[PDB]
């Protein structure tokens, strides 16, 4: 709903396609307006000179204008050709996101927007594609005392998943993306190294 309000209240948000269509329309309209340039000729119109000037003078000025009109076309094509390379690159990126985030949920970092990709949805547009990118972003977090391991019977007990945490009275195990502490048991930890190896190791009974 916020996206719909943003798009309708902030039409500048649509600039990625609106600027493209206006730039291409302007380039083509410029190509038309430049038909009026004389390039040194008495007149800018080829079909004016041919019925207006003494034929040998007309011939010279007509060729000058043909060259001028050609240059306008060459310019247009080169500019559209370079723009086409950028548009192709954009289209390739759009195709990439549609496969990776829409038909997927890519872990590429902040690829389809900040956060972990949960999903993405395409919408059509004149000259382009709109995506709704849905991500997972932490809302709240708290500072817990932590350790890579706990010390028990002289050994370092590591979480199978997560980090050891504490609120000041008891140690538990949690994941980096969510504070849902588990009881420290032999089903949740593994043993390797020792208590003289782990930096930050704390003393905690393993059940």
């Amino acid at each position: 709903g916020k996206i719909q309000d943003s798009l309708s209240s902030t039409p500048s948000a649509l600039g990625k396609l609106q600027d493209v269509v206006n730039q291409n329309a302007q380039a083509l309209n410029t190509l038309v307006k430049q038909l009026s340039s004389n390039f040194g000729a008495i007149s800018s119109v080829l079909n004016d000179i041919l019925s207006r000037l003494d034929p040998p003078e007309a011939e010279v000025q007509i060729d000058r204008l043909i060259t001028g009109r050609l240059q306008s076309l060459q310019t247009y094509v080169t500019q559209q050709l370079i723009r086409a390379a950028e548009i192709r690159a954009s289209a390739n990126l759009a195709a990439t996101k549609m496969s990776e985030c829409v038909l997927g949920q890519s872990k590429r970092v902040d690829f389809c927007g900040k956060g972990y990709h949960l999903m993405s949805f395409p919408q059509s547009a004149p000259h382009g594609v709109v995506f709704l990118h849905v991500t997972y972003v932490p809302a709240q977090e708290k500072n817990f005392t932590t350790a890579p391991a706990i010390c028990h019977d002289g050994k370092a007990h590591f979480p199978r998943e997560g980090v050891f945490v504490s609120n000041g009275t008891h140690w538990f195990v949690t994941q980096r993306n969510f504070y849902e502490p588990q009881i420290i048991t032999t089903d949740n930890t593994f043993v390797s190294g020792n208590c003289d190896v782990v930096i930050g190791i704390v003393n905690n009974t393993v059940y």
């Binding site: 916020k2 996206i3 943003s6 798009l7 948000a13 649509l14 990625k16 396609l17 493209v20 269509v21 291409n24 329309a25 083509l28 247009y76 559209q80 723009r83 086409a84 950028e86 548009i87 954009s90 289209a91 990126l93 759009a94 996101k97 389809c112 927007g113 900040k114 956060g115 949960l118 547009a125 000259h127 382009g128 594609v129 709109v130 995506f131 709704l132 990118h133 849905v134 991500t135 997972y136 972003v137 932490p138 809302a139 709240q140 977090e141 708290k142 500072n143 817990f144 005392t145 932590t146 350790a147 980090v163 945490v165 949690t174 980096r176 993306n177 969510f178 504070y179 930096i199 930050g200």
Partner: protein, 168 residues
């Protein structure tokens, strides 16, 4: 407008900090344009500086709410172009300047952006230092981690061009 024994062009002369050989009545730069000239009646080497020029751009609020504007004259003095801000990005005429850091609204260049705050209130153009956001000097400790509890589902938009006008 200069002519020193047939050597011509335009610009501004100042004393140079370099010496020329007895056979060198002038010097040239990287693209062989005049760097300096010597005065045939008072030999002295005088550097030639291009006559002041630059582009001119206008900083404006939307005209739907207000019409105070200020103008940037690039690479020139505020006296060459009342409330004048001197910068290499161009002297902004019709604007003030404040030392404090703020966000960027309308870019001037070289680290400064204009914005439109009001004063006792009237709106004016003030040039400001860019802040790059709040300086979050977060401290860390080997025994403490910020661990997420709950989360938000954020949905944002991206729009990409796919195709151009099929000109024929």
């Amino acid at each position: 407008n200069f002519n020193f024994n047939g050597l011509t062009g335009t610009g501004v002369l100042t004393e140079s900090n370099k010496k020329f050989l007895p056979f060198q009545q002038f010097g040239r730069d990287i693209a062989d344009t005049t760097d300096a000239v010597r005065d045939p009646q008072t030999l002295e080497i005088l550097d030639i500086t291009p006559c002041s020029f630059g582009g001119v751009s206008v900083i404006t609020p939307g005209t739907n709410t207000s019409n105070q504007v200020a103008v940037l004259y690039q690479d020139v003095n505020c006296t060459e172009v009342s409330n004048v801000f001197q910068t290499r990005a161009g002297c902004l005429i019709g604007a003030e300047h404040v030392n404090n850091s703020y966000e960027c609204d309308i870019p001037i260049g070289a680290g400064i952006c204009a914005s439109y705050q009001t004063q006792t209130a009237s709106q004016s153009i003030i040039a400001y230092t860019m802040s790059l956001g709040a300086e979050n000097s977060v401290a860390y400790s080997n025994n403490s981690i910020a661990i997420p509890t709950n989360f938000t589902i954020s949905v944002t938009t991206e729009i990409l061009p796919v195709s151009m006008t099929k000109t024929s």
